[PDB]
Amino acid sequence: ATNYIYTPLNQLKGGTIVNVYGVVKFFKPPYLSKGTDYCSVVTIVDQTNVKLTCLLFSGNYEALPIIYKNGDIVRFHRLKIQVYKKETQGITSSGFASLTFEGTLGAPIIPRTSSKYFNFTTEDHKMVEALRVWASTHMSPSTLLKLCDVQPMQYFDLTCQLLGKAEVDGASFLLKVWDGTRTPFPSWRVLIQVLEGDLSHIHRLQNLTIDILVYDNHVHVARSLKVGSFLRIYSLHTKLQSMNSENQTMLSLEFHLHGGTSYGRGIRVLPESNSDVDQLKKDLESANLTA
């Protein structure tokens, strides 16, 4: 018989492999580490109010938890528990598997995973609903910032559609994206020599598109993106520039995806099965009719 036991986050012990359920408080989307496998960091919490940071490694990008935003609920199978610098941490073990669900009350319960075969019972539904109830009061809803509401200098997660790509200087790469709304100040424009995508469409959209410069480790990822796909760019940084390189006063909003993975800086492609994409498509349609 198949009997999966889930251990509360406050009853975890080092030197053991377990199964856990939790709400995502923080996460770094999958990224190619300096090693062999892709890496993803996920900090989860449950009713015990105890936090657990998990370091997940895999040779396949999709084998890692398919998390799209904080608040998502995950189920982890074959998670090893160990101590690192007196601090308990979770790490991938052989056969590691995960299921991810939306974390909002009343939301559809559709398990997301790359696994071809996986257990899913009424006990899982109960577990998910139980975490949604808990989170509804111990966490904040999900809230999607449009470009028209970005502030002069802040970090934020942007849901958008990719319209163009362009090499710059190897250390950085350009992504031209849009979400159907206009920034409060015109986007800066990186000098391009190269740009792949619908040039006429881009030109017709004018300031509806913005220029995003990604650096270092983010470059190869940006280079592989398919024009026209939908993306979530985590911890994108806006910076209002009031002085150009020639010492002239002006106003332009820059968008930078800085090197490193701190605070989840990264990019995840959103499938058309994502609810946030359905909403985005309608905004794009509306903006397109007027442009």
From Swiss-Prot:
Residues 28-43, 262-265 are annotated as: DNA-binding. It comes from the Eukaryota. The record marks S235 as: DNA-binding. It is found in: Nucleus; Chromosome, Telomere. Component of the telomerase ribonucleoprotein (RNP) complex that is essential for the replication of chromosome termini. Is a component of the double-stranded telomeric DNA-binding TRF1 complex which is involved in the regulation of telomere length by cis-inhibition of telomerase. Also acts as a single-stranded telomeric DNA-binding protein and thus may act as a downstream effector of the TRF1 complex and may transduce information about telomere maintenance and/or length to the telomere terminus. It is linked to Tumor predisposition syndrome 3: An autosomal dominant disorder characterized by an increased risk for the development of various types of benign and malignant neoplasms throughout life, with age-dependent penetrance. Affected individuals can develop neoplasms involving epithelial, mesenchymal, and neuronal tissues, as well as lymphoid and myeloid cancers. The disorder is associated with elongated telomeres. Cerebroretinal microangiopathy with calcifications and cysts 3: An autosomal recessive disorder characterized by intrauterine growth retardation, retinal exudates, global developmental delay, neurologic regression, intracranial calcifications, and leukoencephalopathy. Homodimer or homooligomer. Component of the shelterin complex (telosome) composed of TERF1, TERF2, TINF2, TERF2IP, ACD and POT1. Binds single-stranded telomeric DNA as a monomer. Associated component of the telomerase holoenzyme complex. Found in a complex with TERF1, TINF2 and TNKS1. Interacts with TNKS1. Forms heterodimers with ACD. Identified in a complex with ACD and single-stranded telomeric DNA. Belongs to the telombin family. This is Protection of telomeres protein 1. The chain holds residues 6 to 299 of 634 of the full protein.
